[PDB]
Amino acid sequence: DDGTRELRYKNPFDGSEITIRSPRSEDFERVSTEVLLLELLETIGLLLSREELEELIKLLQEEYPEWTPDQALQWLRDTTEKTIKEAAEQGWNKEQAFELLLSSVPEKIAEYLKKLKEERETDEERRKQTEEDREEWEEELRERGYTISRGGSG
């Protein structure tokens, strides 16, 4: 995509000009989908950071150069959601649902997911850091007016 919003105005009265830009990665469509996808992956036992999700976006674009960043993110979201649904329909546990996600993504994607998965399990310090960045980013979104409400069965 263009990747950057812009508003530009040239003042005919005093000759000044102002250029206002902001990346599309901070728009609600991108942000809310990223919050959703991190919640989705945690449901099947994978705690990731935003920056690691951005990394999955880049690798996906390398597998499919025609895909935009938004396109790759939505495909990851949909693939994760359809993995959630099929796991709920088959009565699988979190590990089986995670295996289905690995077999639904390209080889380079799955190897990066398994690396991060192993890292969260073997490195307790970095896992706590991942959770720390997750709550920090949520608090930063709440400072911007975001409301993130969780309510389930359990």
Q: Where do contacts with K ion occur on this chain (CB under 5 A)?
A: 58, 61-62, 82-83, 104
Beta-bridge mates of residue 23: 4
Q: Considering the complex, state which of residue 81 and residue 121 has its C-beta at the smaller distance from K ion.
A: 81
Q: Helix, strand, or coil here: 52?
A: helix
User: Which run of H or E residues covers position 5?
Assistant: strand 4-10
If you search the block for the tokens 């970095």, which residue do you land on? 126
Report the nearest approach of K ion to the CB of residue 15 (Å): 41
Q: Considering the complex, state which of residue 58 and residue 128 has its C-beta at the smaller distance from K ion.
A: 58
Q: Compute CA 92 distance to the chain's CA centroid, rounded to the nearest angstrom.
A: 24
Q: Considering the complex, state which of residue 74 and residue 104 has its C-beta at the smaller distance from K ion.
A: 104
Report the nearest approach of K ion to the CB of residue 114 (Å): 16
Report the nearest approach of K ion to the CB of residue 14 (Å): 43
Task: Count CA atoms within 13 Å of residue 15 on its CB side.
Answer: 0
Q: Is the dihedral of CA 148, 149, 150, 152 positive or negative?
A: negative
Report the nearest approach of K ion to the CB of residue 125 (Å): 29
Q: Considering the complex, state which of residue 30 and residue 134 has its C-beta at the smaller distance from K ion.
A: 30
In 3D, which of 13, 53, 47 has the Cα closest to residue 32? 53
Report the nearest approach of K ion to the CB of residue 56 (Å): 10
Q: Considering the complex, state which of residue 62 and residue 95 has its C-beta at the smaller distance from K ion.
A: 62
